[PDB]
């Protein structure tokens, strides 16, 4: 159940808190420092994940490597498109921060 807990927390934040998916939006969120947690799919291209981690470590924001690919991340978010990167602008009443 190593992925079940994170999927459940993702489902909870998708309902309660506000988020954003997409390389551009997540990059902008990290630039402005409003990002709290960035989820990266296992399928993310190496360059994109590298710039994501560099931005996040600059802005002191956590990065979680998703156990699935971008299809799985989209499904977990409840969308019907690939995602491959996520930024949580704010966490609702979800325990994803710890």
């Amino acid at each position: 159940s190593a992925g079940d807990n994170i999927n459940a927390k993702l489902q909870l934040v998708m309902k309660s808190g506000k988020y954003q998916f997409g390389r551009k939006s997540c990059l902008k969120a990290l630039r402005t420092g409003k990002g709290k947690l960035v989820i990266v799919s296992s399928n993310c291209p190496s360059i994109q994940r590298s710039v994501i981690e560099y931005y996040a470590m600059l802005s002191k924001c956590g990065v979680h490597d998703y156990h699935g690919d971008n299809n799985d991340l989209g499904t977990a978010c409840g969308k019907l498109f690939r995602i491959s990167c996520l930024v949580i602008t704010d966490v609702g009443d979800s325990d994803i921060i710890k």
């Binding site: 309660s16 019907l80 009443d93 979800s94």
Partner: protein
């Protein structure tokens, strides 16, 4: 039992006393507030009642407040669009379908998936016979993975 054999009569029987227990000096307003907060934090009503009984010492929420927990959850407007049992059945079917996709030689898992989807269709037929599930709702097996919302 719906499928298979075995009566399995194990269950929970409510006490004869229908009223709030005398020792309980707790007030229904904070009971409902706690139920709302706990549902917001995110739990299905069954486990909501479970943790309410275990950690708050308030058995049979219907005794403390004169109605049911899903009823107050709806009255607050925050009840989920898919009932608990249907949602759990859909989740289980999705999981076993995902497993089957990798291991298509699992005839037993195929059989159990067929049974689960039969249950899903019967339950959804009942729920849409009631007005609490949209009439066009169908549960095609493709988008059920993201249907969990």
């Amino acid at each position: 039992r719906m499928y298979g054999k075995g009566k399995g009569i194990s269950s929970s029987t409510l006490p004869y006393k229908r009223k709030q227990p005398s020792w309980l000096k707790q007030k229904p307003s904070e009971i409902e507030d706690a139920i709302i907060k706990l549902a917001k934090k995110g739990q299905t009503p069954s486990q909501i009642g479970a943790t309410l009984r275990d950690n708050y010492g308030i058995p049979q929420v219907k005794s403390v407040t004169g109605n049911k927990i899903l009823r107050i959850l709806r009255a607050q407007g925050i009840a989920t669009t898919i009932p608990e049992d249907l949602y759990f059945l859909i989740k289980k079917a999705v999981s076993m379908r995902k497993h089957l996709e990798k291991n298509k030689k699992d005839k037993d898992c195929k059989f159990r998936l067929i049974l689960t989807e039969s249950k899903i269709h019967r339950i959804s037929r009942y729920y849409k016979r009631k007005k609490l599930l949209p009439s066009n709702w169908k549960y095609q097996s493709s988008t059920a993975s993201a249907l969990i919302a």
